[PDB]
Amino acid sequence: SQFIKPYNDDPFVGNLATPVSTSSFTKSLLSNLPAYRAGLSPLLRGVEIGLTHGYFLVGPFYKLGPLRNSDVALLSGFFSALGLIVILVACLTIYGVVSFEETEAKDQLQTAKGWRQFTSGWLVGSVGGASFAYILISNIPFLQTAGMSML
Amino acid sequence: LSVVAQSKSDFEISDGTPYTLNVPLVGAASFIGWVVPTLLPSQIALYGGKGLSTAFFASIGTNLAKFPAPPGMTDPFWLLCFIWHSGLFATMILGSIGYNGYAG
Amino acid sequence: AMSESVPFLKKPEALDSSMAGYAGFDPLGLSSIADIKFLQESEIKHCRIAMLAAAGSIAQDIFTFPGVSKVVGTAKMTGVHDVLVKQGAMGQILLWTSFLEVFGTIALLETLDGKRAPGDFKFDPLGFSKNAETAKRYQLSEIKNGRLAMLATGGMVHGYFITGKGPLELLTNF
Amino acid sequence: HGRVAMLAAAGAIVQDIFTFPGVKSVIGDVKMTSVHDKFLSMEAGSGKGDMAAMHQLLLWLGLLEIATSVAIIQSFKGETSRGPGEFGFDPLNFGKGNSAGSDSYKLKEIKNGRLAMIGIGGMVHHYLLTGKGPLQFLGGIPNYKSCVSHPDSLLPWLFKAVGPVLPKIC
Amino acid sequence: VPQTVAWSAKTGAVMVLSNILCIVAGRYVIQVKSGSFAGFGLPELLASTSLGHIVGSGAILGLSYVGVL
Amino acid sequence: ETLNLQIPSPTFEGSTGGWLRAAEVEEKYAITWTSPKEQVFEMPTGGAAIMRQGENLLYLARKEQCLALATQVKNSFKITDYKVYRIFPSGEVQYLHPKDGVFPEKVNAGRVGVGNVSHSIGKNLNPAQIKFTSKSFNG
Amino acid sequence: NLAVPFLKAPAKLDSSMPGYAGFDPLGCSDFYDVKWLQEAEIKNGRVAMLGVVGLLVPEFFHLPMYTAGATPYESYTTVPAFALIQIFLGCGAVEYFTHKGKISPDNMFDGGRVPGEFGWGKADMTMQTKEIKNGRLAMLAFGGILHQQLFTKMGTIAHLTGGFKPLTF
Numbered sequence: 021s022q023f024i025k026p027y028n029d030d031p032f033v034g035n036l037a038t039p040v041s042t043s044s045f046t047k048s049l050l051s052n053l054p055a056y057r058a059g060l061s062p063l064l065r066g067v068e069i070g071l072t073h074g075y076f077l078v079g080p081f082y083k084l085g086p087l088r089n090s091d092v093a094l095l096s097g098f099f100s101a102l103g104l105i106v107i108l109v110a111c112l113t114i115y116g117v118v119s120f121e122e123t124e125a126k127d128q129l130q131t132a133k134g135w136r137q138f139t140s141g142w143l144v145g146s147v148g149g150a151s152f153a154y155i156l157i158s159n160i161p162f163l164q165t166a167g168m169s170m171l
Numbered sequence: 172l173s174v175v176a177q178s179k180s181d182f183e184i185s186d187g188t189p190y191t192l193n194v195p196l197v198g199a200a201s202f203i204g205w206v207v208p209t210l211l212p213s214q215i216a217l218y219g220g221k222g223l224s225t226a227f228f229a230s231i232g233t234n235l236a237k238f239p240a241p242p243g244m245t246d247p248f249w250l251l252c253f254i255w256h257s258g259l260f261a262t263m264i265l266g267s268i269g270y271n272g273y274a275g
Numbered sequence: 276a277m278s279e280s281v282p283f284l285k286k287p288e289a290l291d292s293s294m295a296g297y298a299g300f301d302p303l304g305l306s307s308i309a310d311i312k313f314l315q316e317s318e319i320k321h322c323r324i325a326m327l328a329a330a331g332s333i334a335q336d337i338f339t340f341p342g343v344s345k346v347v348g349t350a351k352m353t354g355v356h357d358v359l360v361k362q363g364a365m366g367q368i369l370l371w372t373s374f375l376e377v378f379g380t381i382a383l384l385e386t387l388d389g390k391r392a393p394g395d396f397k398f399d400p401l402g403f404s405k406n407a408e409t410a411k412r413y414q415l416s417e418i419k420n421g422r423l424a425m426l427a428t429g430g431m432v433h434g435y436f437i438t439g440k441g442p443l444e445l446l447t448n449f
Numbered sequence: 450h451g452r453v454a455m456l457a458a459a460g461a462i463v464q465d466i467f468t469f470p471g472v473k474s475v476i477g478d479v480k481m482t483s484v485h486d487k488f489l490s491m492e493a494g495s496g497k498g499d500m501a502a503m504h505q506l507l508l509w510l511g512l513l514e515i516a517t518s519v520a521i522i523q524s525f526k527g528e529t530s531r532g533p534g535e536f537g538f539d540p541l542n543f544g545k546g547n548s549a550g551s552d553s554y555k556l557k558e559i560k561n562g563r564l565a566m567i568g569i570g571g572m573v574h575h576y577l578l579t580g581k582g583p584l585q586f587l588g589g590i591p592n593y594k595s596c597v598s599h600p601d602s603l604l605p606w607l608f609k610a611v612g613p614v615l616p617k618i619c
Numbered sequence: 620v621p622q623t624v625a626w627s628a629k630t631g632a633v634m635v636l637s638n639i640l641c642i643v644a645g646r647y648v649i650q651v652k653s654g655s656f657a658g659f660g661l662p663e664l665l666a667s668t669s670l671g672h673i674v675g676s677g678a679i680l681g682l683s684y685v686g687v688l
Numbered sequence: 689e690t691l692n693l694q695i696p697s698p699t700f701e702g703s704t705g706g707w708l709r710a711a712e713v714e715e716k717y718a719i720t721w722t723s724p725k726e727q728v729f730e731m732p733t734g735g736a737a738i739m740r741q742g743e744n745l746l747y748l749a750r751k752e753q754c755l756a757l758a759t760q761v762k763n764s765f766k767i768t769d770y771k772v773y774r775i776f777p778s779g780e781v782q783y784l785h786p787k788d789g790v791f792p793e794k795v796n797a798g799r800v801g802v803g804n805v806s807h808s809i810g811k812n813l814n815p816a817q818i819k820f821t822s823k824s825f826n827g
Numbered sequence: 828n829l830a831v832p833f834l835k836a837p838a839k840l841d842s843s844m845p846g847y848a849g850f851d852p853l854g855c856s857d858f859y860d861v862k863w864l865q866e867a868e869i870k871n872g873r874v875a876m877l878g879v880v881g882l883l884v885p886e887f888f889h890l891p892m893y894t895a896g897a898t899p900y901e902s903y904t905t906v907p908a909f910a911l912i913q914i915f916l917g918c919g920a921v922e923y924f925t926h927k928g929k930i931s932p933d934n935m936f937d938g939g940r941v942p943g944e945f946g947w948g949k950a951d952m953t954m955q956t957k958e959i960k961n962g963r964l965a966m967l968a969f970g971g972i973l974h975q976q977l978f979t980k981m982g983t984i985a986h987l988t989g990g991f992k993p994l995t996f
């Protein structure tokens with residue numbers, strides 16, 4: 021038995037069909053991620069990706085930022101997450117302006133309207149996830165430490 | 172357990188090759204084939220009169236009693252855990268090779 | 276095609292009404308992750324072990340065997356495990372149940388391949404299921420008591436972790 | 450949201466009426482969200498004590514609610530012909546053969562839910578400043594004249610513009 | 620220090636056993652050459668007896684280490 | 689004349705050195721040739737492939753990759769029956785090499801000389817005379 | 828087959844064979860010659876049957892040449908080891924003589940030699956079954972007797988008729 025074959029039956033394309041690239045587990049994970057999941061509008065793809073990314077962004081800024089030993093550490097960490105979010109949304113918008121011609125198609129990610137939808141959803145979800153992380157850390161003393169409250 | 176020994180799932184190790192990972196049999200057989208020899212006792216301060224599997228399982232229970240506190244650098248847990256999982260992974264690798272490849 | 280036990284969920288795809296103890300209960304989709312036949316063999320195994328565990332809890336309250344009180348003084352439910360690892364009892368049951376598990380492992384591989392039904396070891400010496408009308412009743416009944424005994428075993432051992440009394444002594448001394 | 454608010458509105462009125470046996474000796478004189486904080490001060494994890502009252506509620510409500518999660522996810526993507534709010538719960542026959550109910554009874558449910566959202570918000574904030582609870586507040590139609598000393602909640606910051614910016618009659 | 624013992628007939632016994640063991644086992648396993656009367660020559664005998672003194676020396680030293688002798 | 693798209697390709701196990709997204713959106717090149725044998729050659733993009741007896745066909749990203757394989761087969765296996773094509777994403781196929789049926793190093797009638805300068809290289813114009821003028825430096 | 832009913836029949840063994848009970852869970856008869864497996868089972872049983880008596884009788888009566896040690900097991904550490912070397916080579920001579928130079932799986936059974944037979948006779952299927960089952964019993968018996976004499980350090984019958992102390996190590 022052999023586990024490495026030509027990609028999509030084509031021996032001359034610049035890829036290989038390896039277990040990491042094309043196993044059932046990989047295909048299940050890739051097909052179910054919000055970027056590739058079927059039946060989702062680009063705005064909803066943006067919302068789910070944004071909620072995920074905004075939620076984890078809060079933590080490194082809060083724990084390791086300049087005001088980390090102050091009592092405004094969570095405030096500074098959230099606002100730093102917000103600043104990164106605003107800069108990244110500017111990056112997404114300028115990518116959309118320069119990469120896609122204007123056509124009526126809006127249900128695919130790689131169209132002008134579909135990218136604008138994804139950017140709108142990504143900003144809303146990102147600020148939402150950062151806000152949710154702020155609420156959770158604000159209220160639960162376990163999250164404020166690294167779990168160090170138990171010791 | 173992404174695929175059992177019986178021809179039931181469609182899990183393909185790659186794009187078009189189905190391959191039965193024998194996760195129940197290999198995991199069970201490798202565990203028993205590694206744990207049973209490892210029961211051999213030894214009057215060494217790391218083992219304490221037990222085998223490596225039994226001293227390891229004892230150090231799991233001892234550190235779980237003090238549940239939030241982690242075991243210290245000089246604690247025997249880390250060396251028992253390392254050697255145990257090293258030989259366990261080696262026996263899973265060799266068992267998967269033997270069972271999937273030779274099939275008997 | 277809606278789940279019987281959970282009316283607002285779609286009926287589980289891997290599950291079927293031919294299975295004994297079926298109620299349409301898999302809201303998390305675990306019947307798709309692992310093979311359903313492995314899950315049935317695992318469930319029936321858990322069922323029988325917990326049935327023994329629960330009856331043993333009750334009986335070890337009700338009486339003890341001759342000479343047992345010599346070896347176990349005050350240890351009641353899981354303390355007897357701790358004192359009888361020192362004595363040879365736990366090593367003995369571990370050795371002989373592991374002996375049985377070797378052939379159980381062969382039988383699990385066989386039932387994965389498809390030759391054997393899960394939990395079926397042909398152990399019917401008193402011929403209770405010979406008629407086969409009872410067989411199906413016994414099959415569903417065994418699964419129900421097994422599930423109840425899993426919950427009960429957990430609920431007694433946790434009642435003993437709380438009070439130390441053990442099941443019957445918890446009940447009689449409220 | 451409407452159903453949870455309706456339970457909350459009913460709970461506040463009943464808690465003012467009476468309490469179950471033995472509760473008064475544990476919580477003391479706490480009503481309408483102060484009892485939430487009081488229980489949480491005596492529960493493992495959040496506080497230090499021998500209770501799991503809010504935690505047991507969280508456990509079973511969360512089990513039911515992961516089940517409803519799967520229902521909402523399936524209903525969103527069109528895999529199910531189930532309407533909103535219908536979980537099939539109708540043990541005594543009220544809709545005469547359909548658990549979904551009649552058009553009029555779901556209209557009754559939705560309007561009473563909206564009413565209870567408004568009402569439970571009102572009851573919560575009137576307690577947060579007077580400390581009286583529903584029936585004392587509704588009896589005490591001249592209010593701020595004498596108010597109950599009640600603890601700061603688990604979010605005191607929100608009570609920081611009441612003093613130096615807003616009037617703070619209390 | 621691990622305890623070794625002066626030569627006795629038990630040491631001779633372990634050596635002889637390992638030696639015969641390696642003759643028979645080697646006779647089957649060796650891939651290039653009447654169970655022992657077909658194709659048995661001096662290099663096969665000398666190789667099986669060299670592995671016999673290796674297995675035997677290891678067996679003698681280990682059984683002296685643990686106390687079996 | 690036109691590329692018969694159905695020609696079987698040399699047996700190959702695949703590689704990462706093959707063509708990328710620019711091949712299906714800008715241009716791809718194809719090479720066909722006849723082999724008397726079923727023999728191993730080296731791909732311009734990577735490891736080894738085996739050419740099938742009869743007619744073979746490859747797709748490469750660069751024209752130079754097609755010509756590097758063509759020189760390799762001609763020297764190693766004495767095969768000169770190679771035709772190189774350019775293929776556009778519209779489906780249109782452009783025959784490339786040898787351009788008029790005859791190899792470039794062999795002369796042919798009807799070839800018109802392009803790029804030929806009537807004087808020697810030192811007779812070019814200095815840059816100053818042709819500054820702010822469109823006139824070319826080649827005289 | 829019949830012994831372990833929740834497994835398949837081995838289908839390499841049959842009721843023709845003497846001590847057959849349909850008991851082959853691991854499928855050992857699929858990977859080795861069954862003639863060799865039968866030959867090994869009977870010979871291992873015959874050595875074990877001598878070994879049981881070899882553990883029982885020297886308690887009551889030990890030869891005047893030797894010293895008996897403490898238990899019939901431990902007696903191999905007190906008799907001269909050259910004596911057991913001749914035991915080993917004499918049994919090897921018996922192996923090379925009774926088997927006519929054939930000492931390997933490919934080599935045995937060349938002339939149609941039946942597994943049990945070394946030329947002492949031909950027996951009924953029942954008689955061969957009796958031999959096999961007594962051999963299996965004496966194989967299990969040897970392990971119990973030997974380990975009992977090991978841990979207790981007492982003679983088997985001295986332990987049995989005297990206080991039946993648990994085996995401990």
Ligand code: CLA
Nearest residue numbers: 324327328330331334335338339340343347355356364398
């Ligand atoms: C998972 C189950 C389990 C476990 C771990 C234990 C563990 C223990 N028990 Mg409990 N016990 C059990 C089940 C269990 N028991 C059951 C099912 C009963 C009977 C209702 C009892 C009744 C019992 C008593 C009365 C006593 C113990 C005692 C003990 C201790 C020593 C072992 C002993 O003497 O057992 C004795 C147990 C038995 C003889 C019951 C065995 C029941 C068998 C296994 C059922 C199987 C029957 C079936 C026909 C076999 C088919 C095989 C199949 C796989 C093919 C120990 C802490 C002793 C102790 O220290 O208590 C303080 C003691 O006095 N047990």
Ligand code: CLA
Nearest residue numbers: 639640643866867870871874914915916918919922926930
């Ligand atoms: C000169 C010695 C000698 C020789 C050449 C043979 C030859 C044979 N014997 Mg015999 N045998 C002998 C002595 C010998 N035997 C003695 C003294 C015993 C003990 C009473 C046995 C017990 C015996 C049994 C029980 C069996 C054989 C079998 C066989 C056959 C296959 C194995 C083989 O080729 O040899 C390999 C054997 C030897 C080189 C000598 C064996 C003596 C034992 C095993 C001591 C070994 C110690 C050590 C624990 C071995 C483990 C290795 C490792 C852990 C270090 C072959 C006909 C097997 C068969 O199927 O026969 C048809 C079979 O089942 N023999």
Ligand code: CLA
Nearest residue numbers: 873876880943944945946947948949950954955957958961
């Ligand atoms: C009690 C166990 C027992 C039994 C039932 C048998 C039975 C048999 N053996 Mg086996 N055998 C045994 C012990 C036994 N033997 C032992 C210990 C040895 C080692 C010395 C041998 C070595 C041996 C060889 C080398 C051969 C046999 C053969 C045979 C068969 C003889 C064929 C024949 O004439 O048919 C009729 C059968 C008989 C007349 C057998 C009578 C049974 C005897 C007399 C057992 C009596 C036991 C007696 C109480 C002695 C106790 C002494 C002890 C306390 C020291 C027969 C199936 C031959 C054969 O064909 O293999 C199948 C063969 O070649 N046997």
Ligand SMILES: CC1=C(C#C/C(C)=C/C=C/C(C)=C/C=C/C=C(C)/C=C/C=C(\C)C#CC2=C(C)C[C@@H](O)CC2(C)C)C(C)(C)C[C@H](O)C1
Nearest residue numbers: 455458459539540541561564565568571572582583586587
């Ligand atoms: C559905 C179902 C069933 C069921 C069930 C259950 C448990 C149904 C429960 C229904 C309930 C509990 C409804 C309660 C609604 C409350 C409202 C509308 C009030 C809001 C308050 C206001 C406006 C106010 C106010 C106030 C202000 C702000 C200031 C305050 O100081 C005081 C004051 C009070 C005056 C059953 C089990 C029979 C089965 C069946 O087959 C299916």
Ligand SMILES: CC1=C(C#C/C(C)=C/C=C/C(C)=C/C=C/C=C(C)/C=C/C=C(C)/C=C/C2=C(C)CCCC2(C)C)C(C)(C)C[C@H](O)C1
Nearest residue numbers: 457482485486566567569570571573574577601602603604
């Ligand atoms: C347990 C816990 C606590 C708690 C708590 C709880 C239960 C808090 C609940 C708070 C709620 C539900 C507040 C509701 C506010 C509703 C408003 C402002 C309605 C506006 C409607 C309008 C303007 C309608 C306008 C209109 C009308 C009239 C007519 C025209 C149309 C329309 C536009 C619809 C804490 C946080 C206090 C802490 C404590 O330690 C732990």
